[PDB]
């Protein structure tokens, strides 16, 4: 185990990619909540 396995660099990418769509999803909501706010802002 103390040695790097023959393959894994792909897993490296897999890990970060998760974070990608991850943090991405959260920000999506932030803007989403903001969007209704703006739509409401538009109404007022």
């Amino acid at each position: 185990a103390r040695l790097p396995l023959p393959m894994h660099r792909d897993a490296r990418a897999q890990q970060t990619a998760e974070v990608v769509h991850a943090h991405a999803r959260g920000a999506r909501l932030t803007a989403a909540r903001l969007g209704r706010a703006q739509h409401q802002i538009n109404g007022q």
């Binding site: 959260g26 932030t30 909540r33 903001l34 706010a37 802002i41």
Partner: peptide
């Protein structure tokens, strides 16, 4: 994230 929540509350 907390700052964003505060901004949403202000809005």
């Amino acid at each position: 994230t907390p700052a964003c929540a505060k901004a949403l509350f202000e809005a």
